[PDB]
Amino acid sequence: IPIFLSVLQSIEPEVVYAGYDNTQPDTSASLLTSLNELGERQLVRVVKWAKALPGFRNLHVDDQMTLIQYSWMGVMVFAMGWRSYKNVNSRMLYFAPDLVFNEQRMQKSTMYNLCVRMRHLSQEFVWLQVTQEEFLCMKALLLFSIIPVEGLKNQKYFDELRMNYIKELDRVISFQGKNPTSSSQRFYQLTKLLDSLQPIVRKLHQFTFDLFVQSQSLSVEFPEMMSEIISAQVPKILAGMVKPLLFH
Amino acid sequence: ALLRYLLDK
Ligand SMILES: CC(=O)[C@H]1CC[C@H]2[C@@H]3CCC4=CC(=O)CC[C@]4(C)[C@H]3CC[C@]12C
Numbered sequence A: 001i002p003i004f005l006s007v008l009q010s011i012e013p014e015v016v017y018a019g020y021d022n023t024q025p026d027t028s029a030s031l032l033t034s035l036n037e038l039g040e041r042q043l044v045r046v047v048k049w050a051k052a053l054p055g056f057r058n059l060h061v062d063d064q065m066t067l068i069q070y071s072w073m074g075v076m077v078f079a080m081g082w083r084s085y086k087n088v089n090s091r092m093l094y095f096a097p098d099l100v101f102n103e104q105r106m107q108k109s110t111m112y113n114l115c116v117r118m119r120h121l122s123q124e125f126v127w128l129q130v131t132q133e134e135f136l137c138m139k140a141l142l143l144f145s146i147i148p149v150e151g152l153k154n155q156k157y158f159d160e161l162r163m164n165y166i167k168e169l170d171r172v173i174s175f176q177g178k179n180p181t182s183s184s185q186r187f188y189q190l191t192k193l194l195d196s197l198q199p200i201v202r203k204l205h206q207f208t209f210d211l212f213v214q215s216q217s218l219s220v221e222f223p224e225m226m227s228e229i230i231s232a233q234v235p236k237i238l239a240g241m242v243k244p245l246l247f248h
Numbered sequence B: 001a002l003l004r005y006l007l008d009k
Helices: A005-011 A028-052 A061-088 A103-108 A112-128 A132-144 A155-176 A180-213 A224-238 B002-008
Strands: A093-096 A099-101 A146-148 A242-244
Touching: A005 A132, A005 A155, A028 A061, A028 A093, A028 A099, A028 A103, A028 A224, A028 B002, A061 A093, A061 A112, A061 A132, A061 A146, A061 A180, A061 A224, A061 B002, A093 A112, A099 A103, A103 A112, A112 A180, A132 A155, A132 A180, A155 A180, A180 A224, A224 B002
Parallel strands: none
Antiparallel strands: A093 A099, A146 A242
């Protein structure tokens, strides 16, 4: 009865490397720059993934741009939490196979408290024992979690497509669960986990803006496409021009 | 324009 599970398994992007030189001594600038680079190349793959998500390419192109601009941070934080879970049991932040943050790096990064919050989020994957299929469904849903306060070009269609992917998450749970009561509870837990991303991503957007503004004094380069996305929509997010779409 | 370029591919 789940109709998207194998599609989502086949369009899932491969793992991206940072290219960080893990022999240099860590600095704030080296760590945040490396993260920006990794972010750029992950964003390229997130765009190819979003384009392959059934129904997405049927939204107006301006809505596709809006959705990616708004949700890239949430999608990438969620994917990174999943990687941390599957590879180091959420003990360290697994940005890339060649950029793992231990405690020390979290301190040098200058964004320690945000790193701790993101590691707590990965621990939620550990406690819930999130399966790969649930992960893929929820990550697809994260592309439908934020919209402009005035809405999209075709709101009606976005609403129906979002409802369709919510239903798919439920179908995956009931395909895997035991009882109707247990699967209802599981849906509740996993939509709460999705909802809990929003305050984290808000804080991360604030930090991102702070860094973007200070990029010259801090020697933190932002690559081209990240710069254009950030300066395009992060001020609007911080100004309250967007509205989270809650799942629970 | 870069995001729009990736979308139009
Ligand atoms: C401002 C900055 O340099 C940091 C603050 C939060 C950071 C992001 C946090 C989430 C993240 C996870 C990844 O796996 C790719 C890089 C990204 C997307 C990071 C890129 C650099 C950011 C944007």
